[PDB]
Structures are given as C-alpha cells and as structure tokens.
C-alpha cells in the first residue's frame, strides 16, 4: 500500500495535465498552447521531485478514439526502460493529439534524467529526445497546423536541451546541439520565437571559458530582441552571463547594475550553490570598481559558506596589509577558482589602491598631496602626484589640481542642489519612472 | 582566421576562404560579419575567383540575420550557385523569402498597367521558376497555382493550369473558387478568359464551366459565338439550357446584344 | 489549397483590422 500510493497520485496528476493541455489545444489559437503548459511544466517539476510505473502509464498512451480513462484502468491492470521509451509509439500510434504526443514523449525522459545514470542509457534518453526533437522539427515545417507545439513543446524541447546539456556535462560539450539550436533560431526567425537560444549560447560561452572570450563577443553581436522575457528567470540567466561578459571585458560599471537586476529576478529558491554564484559576481565587480560593499545587506547562508574567503578579502581591501591579502589569496584561492571569477580577484590585487582614493574623494573636498601620500602610504610625493592622475580616472569629481600650492584640489561638483545645475539631474530621474507608466497600457491590452 | 586568408591576395586563397566560410558559417557568424565589407567587395567582383561562391557565403553572413533583400542581392552575385541549392534546409527558407520578395515586386509590376514594369532579377526569377517547376513535379494543383497569381503572370498561370497535366478540378469549377478569393478584377478577367479558353480546349466545353465567361466577362459576341456553335452542331438541348441560364444568371444589356446578334 | 488558405486567412485579418479601427473611433465619439 505505501509504494502504490505515490504512483496513483503521480498518474492522476499526469492525466489532469494531459487533459487540460489537450482540451485547450483543441480550441482557439495562442490560448490553445502554453496557457497551462507552463503550469504543467512546474507540475512536471513537482513530479520530478516526487520520483518504472510511470513508464507503464506512458505505454500505449493513445490508440485512436479517445480511451484515456480505459487506458488509466489498463495502467492499473499492469500494476495488478529503453523498450518502454519507444513502447507507446510501437504498441499503437496516437492517431491524434500531436501536441500531446510530444508531451507524452517528454514524460519518460524526466525519470531517465532522474536516474542520472551518467551512462549510455542516459545517452539513449538523449536519442529519445532527438526523436521528440524530430517531431518538433516537423511541427510547423511538415505539419501545416498552428504552432501549438512551438508555443508549448518548445519549452519541452528546452527541458530536453537541458537534458542534452546534462549528457554533455557528463562528457564534454556538443557544439552540434548549439548548431541545432541555431536551426531552432531560424524557426524563431519564422512566425514564432523562443529565447532558449541565449541560454544554450551561455553554455557555449561557458565551455570555451577562459580559453575563448570570442564566443562572449559573438554573443554580444548575436544579441537580438525577445524583450518579452516571459520566463523572467531566463532574462536573469541572460543577464547573469551578459554581466559576466562585461566583467571579463573590463566593463565592470555596467556589469554590476546588470548583476543587481539579475539578482532581483530569482523566484526559484536557488538555496545552495545557486543564487550565491550570482551574488559572488556582483560583490567582486563592485570591489573591482573600488567602492566597498559590506556583506551585511544580503548575507545568504550558502553565500556565506563561499564568502568566508571574499569576506576576509573585503576586510583585506579595507586593511593596508598586503600580507593579509596574500594570506587570503593563497588560503582561499580554491572555490574562487571553481567560481571562475578567480581572474577578477587577480586583477583586484592591483585595484586595492583605487578603493582608498575613492574614500578620499568622498571624505575630503580639497586634500593635500602630501596627506594623500600618507593616507595611501605612497613611497614618495611625486608617486602620490602620479597616483592623483590615476585618481582622476573617470566618473569622479574634477581634480582641477593646481600642481602647486593647491595640490589635490579635487574640487567636488558645486551647485549640486537639484536646482538649475542639476535641473537635467532631477528631471531625467522622473522621466524614467514616468516612462514606466507603460505598465498601465500593457496590462490594459491583456483582457 | 578567415580574415587572414583574405588579407593575402592570392586567387587560390580567395577560393580557400569562401570554402572555409561555407564549412563553419554557424561557428563564426561574427567573423563573416566583421569581414562582410570585404566579402561584399569579393561577391560583386568579377575578378574574384569565385564571386558566386562569395555571394553564397554572403547569404551565410545573413544566415543568422533575417534580411531577405540581402539574400536577393546575393542571388544576383551567386547566379547559378543560388539556383544550385534548389533544396537546402536554411537556404530553402531564404530562397522562399526571395520568392516572397519576387511576388511583391511582381504584384507591383502587375499594378502598373502603363508598362515600364521594373525588371525582376533574372537569378531571383530563376530560383522562383525552378521551385515552381518542383510544384509541377509534386503534381499538387494548389502548389502549382501557389506562385501563379503571386507572380501575376498569365504565362506562368498557363503552366500552373497544366501542372502535372492531370487538369481535372482545374478544368472545371476551379475558376469559381479563384474568383471568390480574387482581389483585382483586371487581373481576374485575364485569368477568367484564359481558363474558359482552356475549358474550350477540352473536347467538351462544359456550358457551366464556360458560363463564367458568359456572365462575368459579359462579352455578347462570345456568348453569341458559343450559341452559334450549338446551332452549327444543332445541339438544341444544350443550347436551350445555356440561354435560359444566361437570362437567370445575368442582366440584359450584353444579353440583349447577343439576342440582336442571333436575330441577324 | 494552402496557397488559397493563405489568401483566406489574410482576408480575415484584413477585415478584422478594418473593423478594429471602427470600434476605437466610435468609442472616442462616446467619450465626447
């Protein structure tokens, strides 16, 4: 009795998921597909968390005239892997429910992925996914029907793409799957579009990693439209790599804003080893800017376990002791290397001096050159003058250095009173928020 | 290093570069995009060892991009090479996109009744007619008529009515279905008259099939001519129905004129 | 008849867009 009960609830959930998708697909267009398919996908994720009986339920899913209730009785009668994957099509063709057949093909793959064999059997699941992909290829290319499969089964193809990524993660990588995704991008170029292409492209960047940054640059050129970001999590995924691309490309200032936007869009728990990686990129890039971000604002516990290094490193950046920074680099070099942001830490070792100058610029309106030398422990006043030229850098108040008695005049912007001097400054800020009044137009359109 | 191959000025290297670009267009879309200005010079250069192949790789620069018009420009450079890829996954869509460019250009030419119609690209027209020939090979009347009125050319339409030569539904009331969805009467009348002529070409011209010319064309002489043939063959039984059908289906005017032609 | 169906669906959109303008125009008149 205890082992059958999980099977009964899962089978009932799958039957409800199939019935809802099929009924909507039959009536209307656009509302026909993906109206509850995303809900069905989260229900499928719950089914993945909740666990062979599922393959027997899959067997002979459809024959001709609808007999799904009779089929459910037949699944109970079986109670009372590779062959099972192809068994329903072999036993009897559905004779209808083409969007359902792709969903039916997807249902056995999830248990095969759940098994996580990391073996040829998992590759056989990939072969079953390829057969499902062929049905997806013909959904509009050969079938002249509406894109119910493109609207819904493309998400199923995206899950299959992630399973394909799992097989490649077990091995090395498949650029050919990305090329197949490029063919899907041509399908996206057609009447209907999907943003799954960017996520696989992010994996392509990841595979090249340090060895090639061209793929990231190619990604920047590849960037197109898809501002719908219906997944939203997908937009965060695009943002996380896009921010990574800028951070490696030395555009740290743009990257931190992108990472913050990416950090905000995390509806999924991302409890362990997940959101922490997104947090890690934001903190390092802000440290690279030289502004010091304390970890107290967020401090996720899993972020904390990986943050024992960075937290000491943040203390090291505040401290003037290079040896403390060296101890942190040697002791905590591991894990940061796993993150892949270790190269950013290597550039950060030089950046420690910049943090002090930024503190000086906020603290002192007109600091003495010799005083700057004492504050940053410059060996000589001329070295401090050289540092002052570096201090002007970009995005800081004009030094306007006299080069004589004035020394580091570092004059701050004046008349910054949100008055005439900032009249553009405090009106432009309103324009952006007032521009967000678009939400009233967008939601009004939905009814 | 496709750019590096272009940097050395060797004609054999020029062929090597286009072949290498053809091999991995997807892997380095940006590299072709960075060198697209160099590629465009080579594609339009007669001196280039394979300008047609350079045009084929130029379409590959636009493989990621969606510009059909650029592919039509590439078809001009490719010449036969664009036609040579009669069926090729992605290119088949791009040639179809060129067919869409061709139909809109042809519809614009049909719109002009004063002549001076802009010339269709011969290479673009060649891919369109070749795909149109594939539709005749398929034997589907619908596929054959698929570019028949898109080109707005009666000569292509005569080939489409011929199709695989079965001509069963097309040699009957296919005109009525086309007339219902037809947008322009001026192009429609040419289609209507030619289709009734093909019906006349059949050994028996159905009076119902030739009725559309009798009423929609409303040519009094043409109805008099078919009526004269009925008198000549003395087929009074067939003649009786068409005359009554004409009176019910259409107004007098031309009907009165054929009565005048018949009386004298 | 895919070529004919393409014309038929195109006609349906053209008619709907033509009608869509009328509703907005009358609605603006109602506001006055």
């Amino acid at each position: 009795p205890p082992p059958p009960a999980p099977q009964d609830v899962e089978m009932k959930e799958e039957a409800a998921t199939g019935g809802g998708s099929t009924g909507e697909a039959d009536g209307k267009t656009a509302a026909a597909a993906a109206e509850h398919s995303q809900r069905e996908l989260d229900t499928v994720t719950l089914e993945d968390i909740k666990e062979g009986k599922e393959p027997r339920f899959v067997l002979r899913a459809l024959r001709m005239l609808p007999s799904t209730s009779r089929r459910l009785n037949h699944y109970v009668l079986y109670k009372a892997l590779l062959p099972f994957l192809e068994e329903p099509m072999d036993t009897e063709a559905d004779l209808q429910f083409r969007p359902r057949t792709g969903k039916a093909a997807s249902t056995p793959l999830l248990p095969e992925v759940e098994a996580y064999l990391q073996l040829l059997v998992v590759i056989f699941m990939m072969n079953s996914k390829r057969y499902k992909e062929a049905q997806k290829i013909s959904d509009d290319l050969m079938q002249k029907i509406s894109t119910q499969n493109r609207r819904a089964l493309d998400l199923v193809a995206a899950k299959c793409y992630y399973y394909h990524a799992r097989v490649y993660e077990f091995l090395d990588k498949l650029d050919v799957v990305r090329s197949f995704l490029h063919a899907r991008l041509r399908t996206a170029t057609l009447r209907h579009d999907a943003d799954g292409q960017a996520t696989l492209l992010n994996l392509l960047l990841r595979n090249y990693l340090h060895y090639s940054l061209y793929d990231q640059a190619e990604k920047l050129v590849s960037k197109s439209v898809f501002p719908e970001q219906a997944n939203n999590n997908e937009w965060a995924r695009y943002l996380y790599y896009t921010g990574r691309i800028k951070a490696i490309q030395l555009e740290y200032s743009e990257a931190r804003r992108t990472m913050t936007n990416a950090l905000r869009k995390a509806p999924q728990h991302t409890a362990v080893g997940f959101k922490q990686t997104v947090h890690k990129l934001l903190i390092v890039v802000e440290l690279l800017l030289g502004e010091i971000p304390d970890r107290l604002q967020f401090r996720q516990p899993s972020l904390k376990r990986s943050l024992m290094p960075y937290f000491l490193l943040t203390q090291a950046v505040r401290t003037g002791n290079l040896a403390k920074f060296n101890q942190v680099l040697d002791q905590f070099g591991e894990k940061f290397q796993a993150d892949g942001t270790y190269t950013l830490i290597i550039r950060l070792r030089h950046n420690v001096i910049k943090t002090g100058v930024r503190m000086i610029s906020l603290s002192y309106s007109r600091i003495s050159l010799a005083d700057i030398a004492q504050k940053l422990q410059l060996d000589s006043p001329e070295d401090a003058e050289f540092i002052v030229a570096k201090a002007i850098r970009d995005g800081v108040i004009e030094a306007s250095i006299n080069h004589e008695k004035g020394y580091v005049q570092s004059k701050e912007m004046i008349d910054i009173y949100s008055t005439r001097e900032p009249q553009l400054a405090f009106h432009q800020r309103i324009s952006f928020c007032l521009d967000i009044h678009n939400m009233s137009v967008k939601a009004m359109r939905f009814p | 290093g496709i750019i590096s191959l272009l940097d050395e000025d060797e004609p054999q290297l020029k062929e090597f570069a286009l072949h290498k670009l053809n091999a991995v267009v997807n892997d380095f879309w940006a590299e072709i995009s960075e060198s697209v200005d160099k590629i465009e010079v080579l594609y339009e250069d007669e001196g280039f060892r394979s300008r047609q192949f350079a045009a084929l790789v130029a379409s590959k620069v636009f493989y990621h991009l969606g510009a059909f018009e650029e592919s039509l420009n590439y078809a001009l450079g490719a010449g036969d090479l664009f036609n040579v890829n009669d069926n090729s996954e992605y290119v088949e869509t791009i040639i179809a996109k060129c067919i869409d460019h061709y139909t809109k250009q042809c519809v614009e030419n049909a719109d002009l009744p004063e002549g001076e119609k802009k010339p269709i690209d011969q290479r673009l027209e060649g891919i369109v007619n070749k795909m149109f020939q594939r539709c005749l090979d398929d034997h589907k009347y619908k596929q054959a008529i698929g570019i028949a009125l898109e080109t707005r050319r009666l000569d292509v339409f005569e080939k489409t009515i011929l199709e695989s030569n079965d001509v069963p539904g097309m040699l009957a009331y296919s005109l009525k279905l086309c007339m219902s969805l037809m947008q322009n009467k001026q192009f429609r009348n040419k289609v209507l008259r030619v289709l009734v002529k093909i019906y006349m070409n059949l050994e028996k011209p159905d009076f119902i099939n030739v009725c559309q010319c009798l009423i929609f064309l409303d040519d009094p002489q043409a109805v008099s001519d078919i009526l004269e043939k009925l008198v000549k063959e003395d087929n009074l039984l067939m003649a009786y129905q068409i005359c009554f059908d004409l009176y019910e289906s259409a107004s007098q005017q031309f009907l009165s004129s054929v009565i005048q032609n018949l009386r004298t | 008849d895919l070529y004919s169906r393409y014309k038929k669906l195109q006609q349906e959109l053209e008619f709907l867009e033509v009608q869509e303008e009328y509703i907005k125009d009358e609605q603006k008149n109602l506001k006055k």
Partner: peptide, 28 residues
Amino acid sequence: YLSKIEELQLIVNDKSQNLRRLQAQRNE
C-alpha cells in the same frame, strides 16, 4: 513552404481579434 508557412504567419495576426473583443467591451 513559401505559400504553406506564410498562411501560418496570418494565424499570428489572429490575436488582433482578441484585442477587438477587449475594445468592444469598452464600447459597451
């Protein structure tokens, strides 16, 4: 595919009828 996938593009334009229903409700 040119005359069998372009009709599919007109299916994309069918969503405008849903907007027409929303505006029709406003007219009422």
